[PDB]
Design a protein around this ligand. Structure first.
Ligand SMILES: [Ca+2]
Length: 363
């Protein structure tokens, strides 16, 4: 699939959140954050709801062995492959990444743009991607590798240019390392972010650079890309992610201005997504909005789900407008401040109206 066709085929995506990226005191464990062990039935339920792509956060952390081989625990790679297969064998697009490892705030986090030993970070990263790519080399273009997740130094202000250079270096190392492994890895789509998956800091003049891809398969036309660009979207945070009841409504259908943000509405969403279209999509790079969503505030405002639905529809529809892939953030938590649309304990739907809103947004 070329850049336009892949977006169409990917449809609406869903994150298998709070599973294989979950870690406590440095060891990944897919149950560590309270979700059950993943089973194929969950992925079948998500497919039945209409999602065509599954994003699978994966952490590695202390399952990476010592230098210089940095060997990944074999049982962990085998488990990741089993979970990938639950989605891949159902005909879905699948994205796998390196997730917790890039955070300063995660115990064992090491893929740090601000870290002092960039030589060791870069070599470890190379060796880790060599192994993950090798494990999945025979998978077709429905499997996408994502270089890393949300990578920054912890500061929400303007990016340090030297640190941005490290980020860009990681993306370049990832691309070239993956291509030089076997199988279909020289041809598959590879997803890369800019700083903290932030749209403004990725599209603006802050230091992001597009990787070269000179080791890719000769079969890819010179005029096409096999790189996609990642951003995440939870704006305005006071509505979407802040864990209190100050703001519980969003968009034009809000019924109370005291419960609605003063910024970040439909006009902002338009400007933001148009900026990704103008910078990247027009140049032949698909864009994946790899996470979006809003937390459950029905404990504060009994009308909140009206707005969670409205927000999800609006973000999905804006992605559709601008020919980019919207991927919903589902963390399995049903309850206060949760993001789940399904109860993973029984594979039931818990948020039919939000699912319907997403699917309406794909029309
Ligand atoms: Ca998060």
């Amino acid at each position: 699939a070329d850049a336009s066709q892949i977006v169409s085929e990917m449809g609406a995506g869903w994150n298998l959140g709070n599973q294989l990226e979950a870690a406590v005191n440095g060891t990944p464990n897919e149950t560590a954050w309270g979700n059950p062990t993943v089973t194929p039935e969950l992925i079948k339920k998500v497919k039945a709801a209409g999602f065509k792509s599954i994003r699978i956060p994966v952490s590695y952390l202390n399952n990476i062995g010592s230098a210089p081989n940095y060997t990944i625990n074999a049982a962990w790679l085998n488990r990741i492959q089993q979970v990938v297969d639950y989605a891949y064998n159902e005909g879905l697009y699948v994205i796998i990444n390196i997730h917790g490892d890039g955070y300063n705030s995660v115990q064992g986090g090491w893929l740090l743009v601000n870290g002092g030993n960039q030589t060791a970070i870069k070599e470890k990263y190379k060796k880790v991607w060599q192994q993950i790519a090798t494990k999945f080399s025979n998978y077709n273009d429905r499997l996408i590798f994502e270089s890393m997740n949300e990578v920054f130094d912890g500061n929400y202000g303007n990016p340090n240019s030297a640190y941005y250079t490290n980020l860009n270096a990681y993306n370049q190392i990832f691309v070239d390392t993956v291509r030089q492994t076997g199988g279909n890895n020289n041809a598959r789509w590879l997803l890369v972010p800019g700083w903290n998956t932030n749209i403004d800091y990725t599209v603006g003049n802050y230091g992001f650079t597009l990787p070269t891809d000179n080791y890719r398969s000769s079969a890819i036309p010179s005029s096409q890309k096999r790189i996609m660009i990642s951003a995440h979207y939870y704006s305005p945070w006071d509505f979407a992610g802040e864990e209190n009841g100050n703001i519980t409504q969003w968009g034009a259908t809000s019924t109370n201005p005291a419960k609605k943000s003063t910024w970040g509405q439909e006009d902002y969403l338009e400007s933001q997504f148009k900026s990704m279209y103008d910078k990247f999509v027009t140049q032949g790079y698909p864009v994946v909005i790899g996470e979006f969503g809003s937390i459950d505030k029905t404990s504060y405002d009994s009308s909140n789900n009206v707005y969670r639905a409205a927000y999800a529809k609006a973000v999905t529809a804006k992605a559709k407008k601008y020919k980019m892939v919207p991927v919903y953030w589902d963390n399995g938590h049903n309850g206060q401040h949760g993001f789940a649309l399904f109860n993973r304990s029984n594979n039931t739907v818990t948020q039919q109206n939000i699912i319907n809103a997403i699917m309406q947004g794909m029309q």
